[PDB]
Amino acid sequence: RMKQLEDKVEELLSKNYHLENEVARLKKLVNSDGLTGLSNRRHFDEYLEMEWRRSLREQSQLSLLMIDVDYFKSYNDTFGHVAGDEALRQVAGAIREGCSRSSDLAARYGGEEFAMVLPGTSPGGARLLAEKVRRTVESLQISHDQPRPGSHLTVSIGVSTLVPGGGGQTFRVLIEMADQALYQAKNNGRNQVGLMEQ
Amino acid sequence: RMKQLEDKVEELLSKNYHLENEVARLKKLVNSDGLTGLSNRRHFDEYLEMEWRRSLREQSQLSLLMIDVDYFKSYNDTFGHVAGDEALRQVAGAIREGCSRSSDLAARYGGEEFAMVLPGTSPGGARLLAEKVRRTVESLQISHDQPRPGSHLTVSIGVSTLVPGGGGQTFRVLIEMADQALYQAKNNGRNQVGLM
Numbered sequence: 001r002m003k004q005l006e007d008k009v010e011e012l013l014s015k016n017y018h019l020e021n022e023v024a025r026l027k028k029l030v031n032s033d034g035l036t037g038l039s040n041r042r043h044f045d046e047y048l049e050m051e052w053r054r055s056l057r058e059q060s061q062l063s064l065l066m067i068d069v070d071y072f073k074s075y076n077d078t079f080g081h082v083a084g085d086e087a088l089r090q091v092a093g094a095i096r097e098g099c100s101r102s103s104d105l106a107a108r109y110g111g112e113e114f115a116m117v118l119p120g121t122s123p124g125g126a127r128l129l130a131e132k133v134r135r136t137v138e139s140l141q142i143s144h145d146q147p148r149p150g151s152h153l154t155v156s157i158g159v160s161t162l163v164p165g166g167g168g169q170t171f172r173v174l175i176e177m178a179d180q181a182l183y184q185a186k187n188n189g190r191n192q193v194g195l196m197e198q
Numbered sequence: 199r200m201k202q203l204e205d206k207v208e209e210l211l212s213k214n215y216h217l218e219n220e221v222a223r224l225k226k227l228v229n230s231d232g233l234t235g236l237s238n239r240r241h242f243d244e245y246l247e248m249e250w251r252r253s254l255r256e257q258s259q260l261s262l263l264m265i266d267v268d269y270f271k272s273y274n275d276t277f278g279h280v281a282g283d284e285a286l287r288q289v290a291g292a293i294r295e296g297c298s299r300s301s302d303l304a305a306r307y308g309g310e311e312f313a314m315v316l317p318g319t320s321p322g323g324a325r326l327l328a329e330k331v332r333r334t335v336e337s338l339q340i341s342h343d344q345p346r347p348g349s350h351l352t353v354s355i356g357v358s359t360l361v362p363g364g365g366g367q368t369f370r371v372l373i374e375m376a377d378q379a380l381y382q383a384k385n386n387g388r389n390q391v392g393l394m
């Protein structure tokens with residue numbers, strides 16, 4: 001039955017290839033990140049652009065947190081990818097729990113990067129949530145040997161807010177500001193909240 | 199040997215199984231309706247639930263259109279399901295022309311129903327948009343023998359708007375009120391907008 005077998009291998013190869021293509025297509029149509037269950041980056045961009053227009057309409061404050069996991073590459077190295085993945089789920093959970101309003105959105109922005117969209121939220125309120133999230137990540141007390149061998153996982157967080165309508169500003173500049181602030185946080189020793197320059 | 203073909207086949211069975219699972223998992227998460235490209239009902243429910251809470255917070259006016267395709271069961275029976283599906287495709291096209299704000303959302307609510315959520319929108323504005331959808335559908339001139347030979351496909355539309363109150367009031371009251379307006383439109387002759 002060696003024709004029988006070789007034939008089945010061929011049948012299955014074809015069926016599998018179809019399924020792999022189907023998976024690829026569906027992934028581009030789904031809003032969530034497989035690992036963490038948060039919004040994926042595509043949906044983040046889409047959602048934030050839409051909120052940009054709502055805030056423009058209402059002249060409301062649109063806030064954004066850009067959140068990065070500190071020393072994460074070394075975590076994967078010294079604890080393994082599987083553990084890393086679980087650390088990411090735990091951080092995501094903290095981020096998710098960090099925003100409670102129906103209009104808040106938590107997203108996985110990249111490999112180890114997250115974002116929170118906060119419609120109708122003042123710079124002050126955004127700052128609070130940023131601290132709340134960072135603090136919640138710490139209280140998770142996930143073990144890391146970096147930089148000190150007795151340390152726990154942390155995030156750095158950049159904060160920005162804008163009322164849309166100002167010349168030359170877009171949801172993309174809102175991101176750029178939060179990224180700027182994120183840099184500050186990291187370069188001031190990480191595990192902290194950096195604020196945009198008014 | 200016959201043993202290398204047997205292992206490879208088992209491997210492929212396993213890969214196949216997991217792939218099929220992943221495809222089914224992802225299909226449940228898709229937010230769009232295949233036929234019309236609008237939001238599906240599950241996404242509509244989620245979106246309306248979130249908008250209700252946003253409107254509660256801002257004490258803003260939240261409007262809803264519930265849209266029935268008139269005599270649609272008869273249409274599908276008379277002209278067949280393929281034709282019916284094409285009619286639904288064209289009506290959806292007419293609808294999504296109907297809203298433009300980043301917060302407006304149109305959906306396939308059910309087999310022959312559509313809905314449109316209009317956050318921050320006054321009753322007057324909602325009626326305006328509803329009339330536009332109604333007019334656009336009729337201009338499609340899709341042939342129908344209902345209510346009589348030589349008619350065309352139309353919609354009846356119910357409009358509601360509420361500023362959410364607290365307590366146990368949920369977004370479902372907005373749907374109930376739009377359905378009541380829709381009933382008025384239908385009982386008044388169809389191919390029109392009912393209101394309240």
Ligand SMILES: Nc1nc2c(ncn2[C@@H]2O[C@@H]3COP(=O)(O)O[C@H]4[C@@H](O)[C@H](n5cnc6c(=O)[nH]c(N)nc65)O[C@@H]4COP(=O)(O)O[C@H]3[C@H]2O)c(=O)[nH]1
Pocket residue numbers: 098099100101104118119120121122124125126128129
């Ligand atoms: N987007 C977003 N922002 C958040 C969230 N949590 C808090 N904030 C921000 O943090 C600021 C201060 O929050 P608070 O200390 O709880 O102080 C709050 C709280 O005591 C009360 N409050 C606001 N809304 C609610 C609510 O929905 N439920 C409850 N229990 N209290 C609320 O009013 C005070 C002032 O509220 P705000 O002026 O709006 O200002 C809030 C808001 O800008 C959140 O989950 N999502």
Ligand SMILES: Nc1nc2c(ncn2[C@@H]2O[C@@H]3COP(=O)(O)O[C@H]4[C@@H](O)[C@H](n5cnc6c(=O)[nH]c(N)nc65)O[C@@H]4COP(=O)(O)O[C@H]3[C@H]2O)c(=O)[nH]1
Pocket residue numbers: 100101102103251252253254255256
């Ligand atoms: N401590 C604190 N908690 C917050 C804040 N923002 C949101 N939350 C939490 O997130 C839940 C959902 O908020 P929502 O979707 O905006 O939905 C809210 C909002 O639509 C409205 N709401 C409640 N309190 C306030 C308020 O103080 N001001 C305004 N404008 N709306 C409120 O009622 C809905 C349900 O309220 P909750 O049962 O309290 O449930 C709130 C509350 O548990 C905040 O700033 N501070």
Ligand SMILES: Nc1nc2c(ncn2[C@@H]2O[C@@H]3COP(=O)(O)O[C@H]4[C@@H](O)[C@H](n5cnc6c(=O)[nH]c(N)nc65)O[C@@H]4COP(=O)(O)O[C@H]3[C@H]2O)c(=O)[nH]1
Pocket residue numbers: 053054055056057058298299300301
């Ligand atoms: N408060 C307020 N905000 C305004 C006004 N004009 C424009 N905007 C703001 O500017 C954005 C783009 O406006 P647009 O280019 O006219 O592009 C608009 C326009 O083409 C159309 N649109 C939405 N609502 C209306 C309306 O009420 N009347 C008309 N003629 N067009 C509208 O849909 C597009 C997207 O709307 P949005 O996503 O909401 O995004 C709108 C909204 O954030 C205004 O008179 N009042």
Ligand SMILES: Nc1nc2c(ncn2[C@@H]2O[C@@H]3COP(=O)(O)O[C@H]4[C@@H](O)[C@H](n5cnc6c(=O)[nH]c(N)nc65)O[C@@H]4COP(=O)(O)O[C@H]3[C@H]2O)c(=O)[nH]1
Pocket residue numbers: 296297298299302316317318319320322323324326327
């Ligand atoms: N949800 C939703 N509602 C819509 C849309 N288009 C029109 N409306 C509704 O229809 C009402 C009258 O629209 P208008 O004659 O264009 O009269 C508008 C228009 O002249 C201007 N406007 C508002 N927003 C926009 C906008 O985004 N773009 C432009 N170009 N004009 C706008 O402000 C006037 C009054 O606006 P409203 O008080 O909001 O009242 C609006 C709003 O309730 C839409 O695409 N989505």
Ligand SMILES: [Mg+2]
Pocket residue numbers: 311377
């Ligand atoms: Mg119905």
